[PDB]
Design a protein around this ligand. Structure first.
Ligand SMILES: *[C@@H]1O[C@H](CO[C@@H]2O[C@@H](C)[C@@H](O)[C@@H](O)[C@@H]2O)[C@@H](O[C@@H]2O[C@H](CO)[C@@H](O)[C@H](O)[C@H]2NC(C)=O)[C@H](O)[C@H]1NC(C)=O
Ligand SMILES: *[C@@H]1O[C@H](CO[C@@H]2O[C@@H](C)[C@@H](O)[C@@H](O)[C@@H]2O)[C@@H](O[C@@H]2O[C@H](CO)[C@@H](O)[C@H](O)[C@H]2NC(C)=O)[C@H](O)[C@H]1NC(C)=O
Ligand SMILES: *[C@@H]1O[C@H](CO)[C@@H](O[C@@H]2O[C@H](CO)[C@@H](O)[C@H](O)[C@H]2NC(C)=O)[C@H](O)[C@H]1NC(C)=O
Ligand SMILES: *[C@@H]1O[C@H](CO)[C@@H](O[C@@H]2O[C@H](CO)[C@@H](O)[C@H](O)[C@H]2NC(C)=O)[C@H](O)[C@H]1NC(C)=O
Ligand SMILES: *[C@@H]1O[C@H](CO)[C@@H](O)[C@H](O)[C@H]1NC(C)=O
Ligand SMILES: *[C@@H]1O[C@H](CO)[C@@H](O)[C@H](O)[C@H]1NC(C)=O
Ligand SMILES: [K+]
Ligand SMILES: [K+]
Ligand SMILES: [K+]
Ligand SMILES: [K+]
Ligand SMILES: [K+]
Ligand SMILES: [K+]
Ligand SMILES: [K+]
Ligand SMILES: [K+]
Ligand SMILES: [K+]
Ligand SMILES: [K+]
Ligand SMILES: [K+]
Ligand SMILES: [K+]
Ligand SMILES: [K+]
Ligand SMILES: [K+]
Ligand SMILES: [K+]
Ligand SMILES: [K+]
Ligand SMILES: [K+]
Ligand SMILES: [K+]
Ligand SMILES: [K+]
Ligand SMILES: [K+]
Ligand SMILES: [K+]
Ligand SMILES: [K+]
Lengths: 316, 316
């Protein structure tokens, strides 16, 4: 059930199946900056504010300097209050989706879920539909990365925001467990600092050529990100573009989020996967072309989804 | 109740109050190309197809040639079937709005109207909120231009699409009367041909300097347009931008619609007024900045609205 032609492909690794670095979690800890010691992640309390509304979306059309003048980037910031109760990680098509290797547009996945805001989530194998990385959907472990080291984001049972690199046992921890968790590629910001260089060492093997991953970081394209600010509010970011023509690169994206006050953030699936569905209707410009017409752009059939909804078992 | 700062102002005439040319309808007929004789308008039957859905929206991110390389324009085409029964022209805030000189975002105006698709409509005085040009809202004459000559679009009682320059009596005709009618500025396409040069002669006085109006045509900015194709389907177009930075000019916009098969079309309010609300949620990038923050973009409080809705007194 392809909806788009998947022609704006921004792939970090080649081939698509060999996703993530093969080196050990030990090596991530060993090769990260000494200032961090043996902490491969960062924690922050999620906001408990019950103010209305849950999510506030803000539009931007901002200029960025290039060697050939300036460039404009269209996108949105979404600020989420009470992410413990309002933020969820959904499988494609509904519960049990990743095990069937389903791909579905964000519109299709949240069909009945009543998601105020929703964007595409983590990475996936384009040919097979296989989900990539750790996935915890509303308290239930969907799958595990078996120790593969990419940037992670999750919410704990007590409402603690987790960003960074997690070992397998940290993911499968039974005490204060993850209630929401997904995996991206590249740790954008760590404790208010740009963390691109450090992500190269952590999420790409030294045996391989520093070519395919560097292109993933330096090329401009559509991007999505998820982070947080001082107030414990979730940041669900997306910037429209077209790989090697429009958008931002992870260096620009990192500084953009940092300038706006994001402490920690990770890069989620970008390119033609970038999708923003506000209150049921698509609200951004996807970069894939439609299955049916060669000049009309369509959203992509993606994997997991990040959804913001009403609190659960609380106001009513 | 300003929602935006009205800082992306694309004004055709100066001052805003002296809207439209002062010359006579006689002069429009006299100074138009002889090939058209004494016909100052064009007619086309509206489609009677009851196929589902009523409106189909299509995204584009298209390149346009500039002297300094290429430029990209984000926007939407909306194709409307059965416009006689599904297309309406709404006053700001609801019936009786233009007489009170109300301005309201498209979201606010269609609050309960259940409009599948909706865009900003005609022009208005920014300082006073006064509506400009002829306005017929669901069969009821709201106001008249008193013979002021700008590009017009309307639907007749029998379903005939009217595009072009109308004299006052043509507007107030009691036999086969207008059921929907609004006024823009600049006739983009006339019978499948670019009609910009001809609009200069018709919609700007020769006494005035050819400076303020030429800038309105040659500057690039956000634009909205309404036209039709061979099949009698309505075209509701919009292209995001920022005056003198992003978007298209009426020359580019005319050829863009012509290349896509639009026979007749007129230019409606552009700049920061450009707004597209799909199924209740804003689906484009407005160019005005928000009243509350200096870097977030907000939609504008505009005047009339073009709404696409379900057929009236027909399926149920
Ligand atoms: C992670 O490291 C901390 C800090 O200790 C580091 O290691 C030392 C060699 C020294 O160089 C410090 O400056 C480093 O920052 C460990 O903290 C402790 O480990 C020792 C174990 O003998 C214990 O005496 C302390 O109480 C520990 N403190 C805490 C808070 O745990 C920590 O054990 C290391 N964690 C893991 C999982 O290895
Ligand atoms: C609008 O013009 C048409 C066409 O006539 C034009 O005028 C002539 C002088 C000649 O140069 C034609 O080639 C032009 O195109 C008018 O058509 C007619 O008018 C005369 C009136 O004496 C009549 O004999 C014809 O039957 C008319 N035909 C039609 C279809 O009306 C027409 O009257 C003009 N309309 C208006 C409102 O002035
Ligand atoms: C999605 O639609 C809902 C409508 O149910 C919006 O809800 C409200 O927003 C207004 C103003 O923004 C508030 O006054 C209400 O209190 C909100 N209601 C609820 C239940 O939250 C909601 O804002 C929309 N979401 C987005 C992102 O636009
Ligand atoms: C606005 O939302 C409505 C939901 O009620 C959409 O309705 C349908 O679209 C699907 C597929 O596009 C069709 O299978 C249905 O028959 C449509 N239903 C109706 C009542 O028209 C509608 O398409 C949406 N409009 C836009 C512009 O996105
Ligand atoms: C950091 O990244 C820059 C890219 O601008 C590179 O030139 C530099 O060598 C990197 N430094 C380290 C220590 O990785
Ligand atoms: C038509 O418009 C062009 C603008 O490119 C102008 O140069 C030309 O003089 C115009 N011709 C007429 C007859 O108005
Ligand atoms: K599928
Ligand atoms: K593309
Ligand atoms: K270290
Ligand atoms: K560091
Ligand atoms: K909101
Ligand atoms: K906003
Ligand atoms: K991908
Ligand atoms: K491993
Ligand atoms: K390589
Ligand atoms: K930097
Ligand atoms: K802040
Ligand atoms: K107002
Ligand atoms: K502006
Ligand atoms: K003539
Ligand atoms: K002509
Ligand atoms: K549709
Ligand atoms: K589409
Ligand atoms: K205006
Ligand atoms: K007059
Ligand atoms: K002038
Ligand atoms: K031309
Ligand atoms: K056609």
């Amino acid at each position: 059930s392809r909806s788009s032609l998947n022609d704006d492909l921004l792939s970090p690794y080649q081939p698509h199946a060999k996703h993530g670095p093969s080196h050990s979690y030990r090596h991530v800890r060993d090769s990260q900056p000494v200032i961090h010691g043996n902490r491969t992640h960062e924690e922050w309390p999620s906001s408990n504010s019950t103010w209305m509304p849950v999510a506030t979306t803000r539009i931007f059309e901002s200029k960025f300097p290039t060697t050939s003048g300036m460039k404009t980037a269209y996108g949105h910031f979404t600020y989420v209050n009470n992410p413990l109760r309002t933020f969820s990680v959904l499988e494609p098509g509904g519960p049990g989706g990743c095990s069937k290797k389903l791909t579905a547009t964000v519109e299709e996945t949240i069909k009945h879920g009543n998601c105020f805001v929703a964007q595409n989530g983590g990475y996936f194998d384009m040919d097979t539909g296989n989900c990539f990385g750790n996935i915890v959907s509303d308290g239930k472990l969907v799958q595990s990365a078996k120790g593969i080291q990419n940037a992670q984001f999750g919410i704990k049972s007590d409402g603690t925001l987790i960003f960074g690199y997690l070992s397998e046992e940290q993911v499968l921890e039974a005490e204060n467990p993850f209630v929401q968790l997904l995996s991206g590629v590249v740790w954008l910001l760590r404790n208010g600092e740009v963390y691109i260089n450090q992500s190269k060492a952590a999420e790409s093997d030294k045996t391989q050529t520093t070519g395919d991953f560097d292109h993933f970081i330096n090329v401009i394209s559509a991007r999505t990100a998820i982070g947080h600010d001082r107030e414990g509010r979730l940041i669900i970011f997306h910037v429209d573009g077209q790989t090697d023509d429009r958008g931002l690169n992870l260096w620009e994206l990192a500084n953009f989020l940092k300038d706006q006050g994001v402490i920690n953030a990770i890069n989620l699936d970008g390119g033609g996967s970038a999708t923003l569905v506000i209150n049921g209707t698509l609200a951004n410009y996807p970069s894939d072309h439609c299955h049916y017409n060669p000049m009309w752009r369509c959203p992509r059939s993606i994997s997991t989804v990040v959804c913001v909804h009403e609190p659960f078992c609380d106001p009513p």
